[PDB]
């Protein structure tokens, strides 16, 4: 229905705003673009589902997220990919892991404060009807 399309449009607006706020945070610069396949050719071998904030925006605009749960699956993927690819005790790996966990925690905290639970519930119910 047009009302349901209005709901999903509001969801996309909400998700773009949250993503932008993550993307402008200096700590998360490393997650703003795909890992460059030409400069880091091993990355695509190891990490089976690359994800980054630019790719998240593209997915929002492609209507790939019909719930905030599905969005958060991709934020979770940004985080878990960083933990997997950079697992060692050296400070470079520890820094990227800390940033990744901070990205995840920040996204969840913004959503906790700003997503109305009944809005998310409606989204889930429209999604499950399709």
């Amino acid at each position: 229905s047009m009302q349901e399309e209005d709901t999903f449009r509001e969801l996309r607006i909400f998700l773009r705003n949250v993503t932008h706020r993550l993307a402008i945070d200096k700590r998360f610069r490393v997650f703003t673009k795909p890992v460059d396949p030409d400069e880091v050719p091993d990355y695509v071998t190891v990490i089976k589902q690359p994800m980054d904030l630019s790719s998240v925006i593209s997915k929002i605009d492609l209507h790939k997220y019909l719930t905030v749960k599905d969005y958060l699956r991709d934020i979770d993927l940004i985080c878990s990919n960083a933990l997997e690819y950079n697992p060692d005790r050296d400070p470079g790996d520890r820094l990227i892991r800390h940033r990744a966990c901070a990205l995840r925690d920040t996204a969840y905290a913004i959503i906790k404060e700003e997503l109305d639970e009944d809005f998310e519930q409606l989204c889930e119910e429209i999604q499950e009807s399709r």
Binding site: E39, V40, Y43, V46, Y85, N86, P87, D88
Partner: peptide, 5 residues
């Protein structure tokens, strides 16, 4: 890990 070069 393998790093980003």
């Amino acid at each position: 890990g393998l790093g980003k070069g």
